Amino acid sequence: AIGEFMVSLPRMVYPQPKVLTPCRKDVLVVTPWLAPIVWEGTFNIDILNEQFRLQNTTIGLTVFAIKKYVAFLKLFLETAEKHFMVGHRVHYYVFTDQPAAVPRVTLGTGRQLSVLEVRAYKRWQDVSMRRMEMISDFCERRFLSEVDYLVCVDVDMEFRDHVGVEILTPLFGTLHPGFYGSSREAFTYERRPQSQAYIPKDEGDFYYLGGFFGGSVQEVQRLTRACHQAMMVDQANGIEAVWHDESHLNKYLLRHKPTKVLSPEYLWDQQLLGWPAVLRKLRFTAVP
Amino acid sequence: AIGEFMVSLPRMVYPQPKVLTPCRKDVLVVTPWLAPIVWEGTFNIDILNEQFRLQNTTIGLTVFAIKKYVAFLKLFLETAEKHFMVGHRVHYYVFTDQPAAVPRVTLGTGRQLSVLEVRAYKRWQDVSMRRMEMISDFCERRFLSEVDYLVCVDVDMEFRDHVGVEILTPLFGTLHPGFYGSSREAFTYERRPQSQAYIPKDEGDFYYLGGFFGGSVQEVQRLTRACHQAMMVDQANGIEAVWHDESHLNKYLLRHKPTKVLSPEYLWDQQLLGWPAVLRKLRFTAVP
Ligand SMILES: O=c1ccn([C@@H]2O[C@H](COP(=O)(O)OP(=O)(O)O[C@H]3O[C@H](CO)[C@@H](O)[C@H](O)[C@H]3O)[C@@H](O)[C@H]2O)c(=O)[nH]1
Ligand SMILES: O=c1ccn([C@@H]2O[C@H](COP(=O)(O)OP(=O)(O)O[C@H]3O[C@H](CO)[C@@H](O)[C@H](O)[C@H]3O)[C@@H](O)[C@H]2O)c(=O)[nH]1
Ligand SMILES: [Mn+2]
Numbered sequence: 013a014i015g016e017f018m019v020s021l022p023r024m025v026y027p028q029p030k031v032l033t034p035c036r037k038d039v040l041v042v043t044p045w046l047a048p049i050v051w052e053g054t055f056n057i058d059i060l061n062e063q064f065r066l067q068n069t070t071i072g073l074t075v076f077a078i079k080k081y082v083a084f085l086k087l088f089l090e091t092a093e094k095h096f097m098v099g100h101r102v103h104y105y106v107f108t109d110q111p112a113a114v115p116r117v118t119l120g121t122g123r124q125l126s127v128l129e130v131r132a133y134k135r136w137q138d139v140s141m142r143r144m145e146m147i148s149d150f151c152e153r154r155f156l157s158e159v160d161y162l163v164c165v166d167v168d169m170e171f172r173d174h175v176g177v178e179i180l181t182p183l184f185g186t187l188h189p190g191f192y193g194s195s196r197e198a199f200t201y202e203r204r205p206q207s208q209a210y211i212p213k214d215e216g217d218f219y220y221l222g223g224f225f226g227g228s229v230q231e232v233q234r235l236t237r238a239c240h241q242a243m244m245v246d247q248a249n250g251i252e253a254v255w256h257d258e259s260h261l262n263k264y265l266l267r268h269k270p271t272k273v274l275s276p277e278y279l280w281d282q283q284l285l286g287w288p289a290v291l292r293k294l295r296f297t298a299v300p
Numbered sequence: 301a302i303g304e305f306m307v308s309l310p311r312m313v314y315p316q317p318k319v320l321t322p323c324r325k326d327v328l329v330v331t332p333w334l335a336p337i338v339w340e341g342t343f344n345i346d347i348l349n350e351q352f353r354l355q356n357t358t359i360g361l362t363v364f365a366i367k368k369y370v371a372f373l374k375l376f377l378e379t380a381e382k383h384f385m386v387g388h389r390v391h392y393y394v395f396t397d398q399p400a401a402v403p404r405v406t407l408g409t410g411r412q413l414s415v416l417e418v419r420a421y422k423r424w425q426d427v428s429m430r431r432m433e434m435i436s437d438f439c440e441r442r443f444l445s446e447v448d449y450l451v452c453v454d455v456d457m458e459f460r461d462h463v464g465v466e467i468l469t470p471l472f473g474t475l476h477p478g479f480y481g482s483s484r485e486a487f488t489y490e491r492r493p494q495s496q497a498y499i500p501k502d503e504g505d506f507y508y509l510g511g512f513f514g515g516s517v518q519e520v521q522r523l524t525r526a527c528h529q530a531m532m533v534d535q536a537n538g539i540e541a542v543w544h545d546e547s548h549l550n551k552y553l554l555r556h557k558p559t560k561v562l563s564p565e566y567l568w569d570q571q572l573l574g575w576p577a578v579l580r581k582l583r584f585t586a587v588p
C-alpha cells in the first residue's frame with residue numbers, strides 16, 4: 013500500500029547522521045525543488061527497507077522484449093533476482109511478441125512474472141515509442157490493482173548491484189550517464205518548436221533517460237498518458253522527436269518535477285564511459 | 301489541496317543545477333532516509349512557489365499565547381506578515397486565555413486570523429504539554445476543513461527572514477539550535493525507561509524542537525494524538541519527561557521519520573548562540 017497508516021519503526025542501531033559531515037561532497041544530492049538525488053552513501057538501506065516492508069510494498073517492473081530483444085531476457089531477469097528489490101514483493105510484467113521465447117527463470121519467494129503478449133511494430137522507433145501507450149492505455153487497471161509502484165526499464169541491460177526501495181517515490185527519473193556533467197545547452201533535448209517535446213536552450217534541469225523511470229502507479233499513468241498524447245500530436249503534425257520517447261519524457265519531467273532523481277549509478281554503460289570516481293557502484297548496466 | 305492533479309509548470313528561466321557542484325558542502329542536506337534537510341542554498345524558491353501556488357496551498361499556523369505570553373503576539377504576528385508564506389493562503393490560529401489581549405494586526409490579502417479561547421493551566425509545563433491535546437482533540441475537524449498544512453510554533457519568537465513553502469511536506473521537525481553539532485549520547489532525550497519518551501543512548505538521529513514542527517493536517521494530527529496519549533500514560537505512571545512535549549516529539553520522530561528536516565536557520569537564539577558561519581540566514585529567532 014501507499015499513504016496508509018504508518019506503524020512505528022522498531023528500535024534500530026545504526027550510525028548517527030552527523031549534520032556537519034556530508035558523506036558526499038563531490039556531487040549534488042538534492043535538487044533545487046528538494047528532491048533527493050540518489051547516490052551511494054546518501055541512504056541507510058536498513059531504515060528504508062523497514063519503512064517500505066512495514067507498508068507491504070509491492071513493486072511492478074515493466075520490460076519490453078520485442079523481436080530480437082527477447083535474447084536479453086534471461087540475463088535481465090536472472091540478475092534482477094539477485095539485485096532488484098530483494099526481500100520485497102515484486103511483479104515482473106514482460107511485454108513480448110514471442111511468449112514462448114520468454115526464458116524459464118527461477119524466482120525467489122514473493123515474486124511473480126506475467127507475460128503480456130503485444131503486437132510487434134516494424135519500425136524500431138515505433139516499438140520504443142509505443143511502450144507509453146502499452147503502459148498507460150492497456151495496463152492501467154491491471155497495475156492499479158496489483159502493485160504500489162511501477163519501475164519501467166529497457167531490457168538490454170543487467171543488474172550488477174543493489175537496486176532497491178531507495179528509488180521509490182511518487183515520480184522518478186534517472187540521470188543519463190552521457191550527460192550528467194554537461195551544461196543544459198549541450199543536452200540533446202528536442203530543439204524544434206514544432207514538436208510537443210521542444211525545450212528551449214535556456215530551460216532544463218537534467219537530461220533524463222527514456223530507459224529507467226517510475227513512480228507510484230498513478231504518477232506513472234500520468235506520465236505515460238501525457239507522453240503518448242504528445243507523441244500522437246507530433247505524429248499528426250509530421251514530426252518525430254530526435255530521441256523518441258526519451259525526448260517526451262524529458263519534456264514531461266521538466267514541467268512535472270520528479271520527487272526523486274536517480275544518479276547514473278542506476279543506468280550506466282561501462283564499455284562507453286568506464287568507471288569514474290564519482291560512481292561508487294554500477295548498479296544496472298548496458299549489455300555490450 | 302494536497303495530492304490532487306498537478307498542472308504543468310510554466311516556462312521558467314533559472315540557473316541550471318549542476319550535478320558535479322554541490323552549493324552546500326559544509327552541511328548534511330539529506331537524511332539517511334532521503335528526507336531533505338532544508339538549508340539556504342538548497343532550494344530555488346521560485347520553483348517551489350510555483351508548485352505550491354498551482355495547488356492553491358493553504359497553510360495554518362498555530363500559536364499559543366497563554367497568561368503573560370500574550371505580550372509576544374504583536375511582534376510574532378507583525379513579523380509573520382513580513383516573512384511567513386508571503387503570497388500563499390495563510391490562516392493563523394491563536395490559542396489564548398485572553399481573547400481581548402490579542403493585538404489588532406493588519407494582514408495581507410488572502411490571510412486570516414482566528415482567536416480560539418482555551419483554559420489556562422496553572423503549571424507552566426501543563427500549558428506547554430497540553431498543546432498536543434488542543435491541536436489534536438479539539439481542532440481536528442476545523443483544520444481538516446480549512447488548511448492543507450499545519451505549522452505549530454512557540455510564540456516567544458520573531459521572524460527575521462523568509463520562512464516559506466520549502467518547509468512543507470507530510471511531516472517535518474526542526475533541528476534544535478543547541479545540539480545540531482552534538483553526538484547522540486549528548487542529546488537531552490528522556491533517558492528513564494519508565495517514560496514513554498525513553499530513547500536509549502545508542503538510538504537517535506537528531507534532537508528536534510518542541511517549538512517548530514508541522515506537516516499535512518493528517519500527519520500533524522497523528523503526531524499530536526500520539527504525543528498526547530504518551531503524555532497521559534506518563535502522567536498515570538507518575539513521571540514527567542525531562543523536556544516535556546519536546547521529549548515526546550523526539551520519541552515520535554525517531555519512530556516516524558520526518559519527510560523533511562528544517563535546519564536551525566528556522567529556530568535560532570542569537571543571544572545564546574551567536575551567528576555561526578554555517579548559518580547563512582537566521583529566519584525565526586527567540587525574543588531576548
Ligand atoms: O526491436 C525492439 C526495439 C526496442 N525494444 C525495447 O525498447 C528498448 C529501447 O531500445 P534500445 O535499443 O534499448 O534503445 P537504446 O538506443 O539502447 O536507448 C535509447 O533509446 C531508448 C528508446 O528511446 C531509451 O529508452 C533510452 O533511454 C535511450 O538511451 C529496448 O531495450 C527494448 O526493451 C524491443 O524490445 N525491441
Ligand atoms: O505560560 C505559558 C507557557 C507556555 N506558553 C506557550 O508554550 C510555548 C513554550 O514555552 P516557552 O517558554 O517558549 O519554552 P522554552 O523554554 O522557550 O522552549 C522549550 O520548551 C518548549 C515547551 O516544551 C518547546 O516548545 C521548545 O522546543 C523548548 O526549547 C510558549 O512560547 C508559548 O507559546 C504560553 O503561552 N504560556
Ligand atoms: Mn538499450
Ligand SMILES: [Mn+2]
Nearest residue numbers: 454456511586
Ligand atoms: Mn520559547
